[PDB]
């Protein structure tokens, strides 16, 4: 895999600040997969792994705190919030409860809250990319890259050293 590849990804705007891409590549050709605990907190574990120094398996509490303030500022205006269908307060009461799963909705709000770019890369089988979903305007080299696999798991990705 060439450096020319990661550099030339084509992102298509879905709405302001959200993009999609369908590149064809294998995750492990450009990324190191950093596996997460596998409790109901893997979404928040993945974010913490890539944003907090000296990350441990309780770091994710800071990420969820961030998501709460994010929700207060942004939840009502988020497009997935209608899929959820709960009031801000009902939403918060659920989201903050132990082992409640994270999702693209939290990734959207968190991107705004921490001024970062998050990419969720989806694979249907093996590590063959089906889609990349990007929240925020940064590129892949500056993004918080997550891997969503097996329909229900989130892991963190780091770009391999030779591609930076």
């Amino acid at each position: 895999g060439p450096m020319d590849f990661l550099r030339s990804l084509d992102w298509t705007q879905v709405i302001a600040g959200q993009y999609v891409s369908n590149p064809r590549f294998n995750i492990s050709d450009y990324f190191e997969i950093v596996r997460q605990p596998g409790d109901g907190n893997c979404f928040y574990h993945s974010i913490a792994e890539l944003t907090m120094p000296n990350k441990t398996d309780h770091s994710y509490h800071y990420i969820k705190r961030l998501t709460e303030s994010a929700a207060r500022k942004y939840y009502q205006e988020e497009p997935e919030a209608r899929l959820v269908g709960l009031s801000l307060e009902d939403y918060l009461k659920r989201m903050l409860s132990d082992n409640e799963w994270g999702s693209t909705l939290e990734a959207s709000m968190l991107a705004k809250e921490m001024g970062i770019t998050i990419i969720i890369w989806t694979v249907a089988a093996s590590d063959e990319v089906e889609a990349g979903i990007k929240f925020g305007d940064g590129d892949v080299f500056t993004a918080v890259n997550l891997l969503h696999s097996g329909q229900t798991h989130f892991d963190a990705l780091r770009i391999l050293p030779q591609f930076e």
Partner: protein
């Protein structure tokens, strides 16, 4: 203010000052969605131009317009693109709701309706609204956006 004469209806008044605000008003008094409204200056009969100010079409304080309601229920084909970037074709009517389109997408894609949301030209489609409100055309491409949980 300006008087609006329904054709088979009667009459009513509204206050403004674009053609797009005139339709929002009409819609806010008789519920007829903008996309089904046709307008013309009375009694000149001259169509109302969508992209020009009312003052430049002979409309001012206390003018009259004729509202004609167009069906717009003629079926058409549009594309809905899935997460893999693969589109499928759907027949629809501009009078169908977004939620109805979501039912079709759901059956074809195998994804329950609470796990995706649709967009057209950067606008999220709202379940309760008619497709016509978004200006969909034959072979327009809608995006199917997945909600991912884990």
């Amino acid at each position: 203010d300006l008087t609006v004469k329904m054709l088979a209806g009667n009459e009513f008044q509204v206050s403004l000052m674009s053609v797009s605000e005139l339709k929002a008003q009409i819609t806010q008094k008789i519920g007829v969605h903008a996309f089904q409204q046709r307008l013309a200056v009375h009694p000149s009969g001259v169509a109302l131009q969508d992209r020009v100010p009312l003052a430049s079409q002979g409309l001012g304080p206390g003018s009259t317009v004729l509202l004609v309601v167009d069906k717009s229920d003629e079926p058409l084909n549009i594309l809905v693109r899935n997460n893999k970037g693969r589109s499928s074709t759907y027949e629809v009517r501009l009078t169908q709701t977004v939620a109805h389109l979501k039912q079709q997408v759901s059956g074809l894609e195998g994804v329950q309706d609470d796990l995706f949301w649709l967009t057209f030209e950067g606008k999220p489609l709202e379940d309760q609204l008619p497709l016509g409100e978004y200006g969909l055309k034959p072979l327009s491409t809608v995006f199917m956006n997945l909600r991912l949980r884990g």
